[PDB]
């Protein structure tokens, strides 16, 4: 085990004006051609998704992608009220692999039901990793990778209620968020989620959370309050900040046979004055562009918080963007050959 300079490993094209390509060129580098994956024989490696510096390396690194390409018109840190430029951009995250340098290789937990902290049996070793889309969001984890056998619950400390719980799903549920054209508030948008698919997943999640809380009861309520970014589903859709009210997604009403089934349309809005996930402060952007704005994402995860005799109430949480990267780098670890 060790902790080294894990360099950004790209897959970008040196001629696209898309902002995730014009940043990988500068920080990331080309990928390893034929990546190694030899199955380590009779090996027991201990992992900790909450300590793997790959999370720190990425968080520190993803910040640079937003500073370079998502400059807000006005930043409002403590005291100073800085101004700069607001060029509208082409925005669509591209995957980032994290190769290791010579002397160190990445151990990859190939277990199906490993929860995040403990031993992995089927341990392999690789140079790069599978692609990671740098999607910043709250409550729901988008455009990731799915679980392989069952839904897995990942929490650094379940008893510590203030810790966010990560739910990794075994089947995806697409979410199609759209700001329509003249078809009229240009700041108004909506997201469509399959109610039949979603409630079946929530039911599966509801059944899974029983096994971790002594087979008791489950309740999904809406967040208490505070910043919109955590009380609503927030994400960037092609340079536009979306905030979507997820009251209809976490509706205990629809986890028997009633009026579920139908399409779940969430009222969303496009904020210009948003809170910064870089650090403490607020920023301000420009109003949206002409035409259609579309984002067909894939809910591959859910970020939940607990209030903490019987019932156990949960809330859509998130906020700590470090945990977004922990939903994709849990199966990786850096050691050393020398």
């Amino acid at each position, epitope marked *: 085990d060790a902790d080294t300079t894990l360099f950004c490993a790209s897959d970008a094209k040196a001629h696209e004006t898309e902002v995730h390509n014009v940043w990988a060129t500068h920080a990331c580098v080309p990928t390893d051609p034929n990546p190694q994956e030899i199955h380590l024989e009779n090996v027991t490696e201990n992992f900790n998704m909450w300590k793997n510096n790959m999370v720190e390396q990425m968080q520190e690194d993803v910040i640079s992608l937003w500073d370079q390409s998502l400059q807000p*018109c*006005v930043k409002l840190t403590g005291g100073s009220v800085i101004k700069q430029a*607001c060029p*509208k951009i082409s925005f669509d995250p591209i995957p980032i692999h994290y190769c290791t340098p010579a002397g160190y290789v990445i151990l990859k937990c190939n277990d199906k039901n490993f929860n995040g902290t403990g031993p992995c049996k089927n341990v392999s070793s690789v140079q790069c990793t599978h692609g990671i889309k740098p999607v910043v969001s709250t409550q729901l984890l988008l455009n990731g990778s799915l679980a392989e056998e069952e839904i897995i619950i990942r929490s650094e400390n379940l008893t510590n209620n203030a810790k966010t719980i990560i739910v990794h799903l075994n089947k995806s549920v697409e979410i199609n968020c759209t700001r329509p054209s003249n078809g009229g508030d240009i*700041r108004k948008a909506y997201c469509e989620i399959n109610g039949t698919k979603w409630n079946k997943v929530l039911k599966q999640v509801t059944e899974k959370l029983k096994e971790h809380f002594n087979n008791k009861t489950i309740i999904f309520q809406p967040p208490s309050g505070g910043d919109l970014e955590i009380t609503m589903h927030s994400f960037n859709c092609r340079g536009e900040f979306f905030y979507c009210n997820t009251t209809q997604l976490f509706n205990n009403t629809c986890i028997t046979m009633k009026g579920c089934n139908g399409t779940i349309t969430l009222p969303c809005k496009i904020k210009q004055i948003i809170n910064m996930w870089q650090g403490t402060g*607020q920023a*301000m952007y420009a*109003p*949206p*562009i002409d035409g259609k704005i579309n984002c067909v994402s894939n809910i591959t995860g859910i970020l939940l918080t607990r209030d903490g005799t019987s019932n156990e109430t949960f809330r859509p949480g998130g906020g700590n963007i470090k945990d977004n990267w922990r939903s994709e780098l849990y199966k990786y670890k850096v050691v050393q050959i020398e």
Partner: antibody
Amino acid sequence: VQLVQSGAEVKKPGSSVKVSCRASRGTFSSYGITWVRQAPGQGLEWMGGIIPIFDVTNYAQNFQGRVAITTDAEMSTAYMELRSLKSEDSAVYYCASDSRDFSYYEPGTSYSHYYNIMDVWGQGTTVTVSS
Amino acid sequence: EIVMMQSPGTLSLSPGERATLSCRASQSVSSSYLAWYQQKPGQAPRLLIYGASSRATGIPDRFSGSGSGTDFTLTISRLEPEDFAVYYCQQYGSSPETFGQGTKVEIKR
């Protein structure tokens, strides 16, 4: 997009009027609103205004303590209540918000000017305080 | 507060000639925040200049606005029959956002 005022109201000394300002499209989310008045044969007189970047609402010392600016929930309609009327408050009450709100994106204009620029104005709510 | 003394009260000119109005501030203003308005006695006022120099949406190019600090000026290259009205300036940097007293662009005859 234009702002829709309340009607011309005749009030009595010691009463309280509340003027409306509804926007056709969009909201007042980013730059907000600002209230202005003009007495008969006088100049303009700043009343108050919402500044949504600082999340503050402020008035002047001539009108503070008895003037309150409110909005809706989504900031599509804003109001102005003036408790304790007087013949000195007989005037025309106006309403101004920013045009950079909605519209779209101008190549074009500056969006790092966070203060409300007040280019979309109201119809005018002529208010007469008499007995 | 910031008193905003404009000058003069009435500017007597004939169409085609140049008009130059002056808005002086008692204290300094964040130069980027001063606006000019125009009220034709009969309807509502409207924006002509914001940020001391930026024209409002759709204002003719004959309307030049400039200045900084405490010395501001609204310039008109050539008057037209749709410009003889009252003009106001407004600081809106540090509240209270006070207005000026007014300036009537009169027909000289």
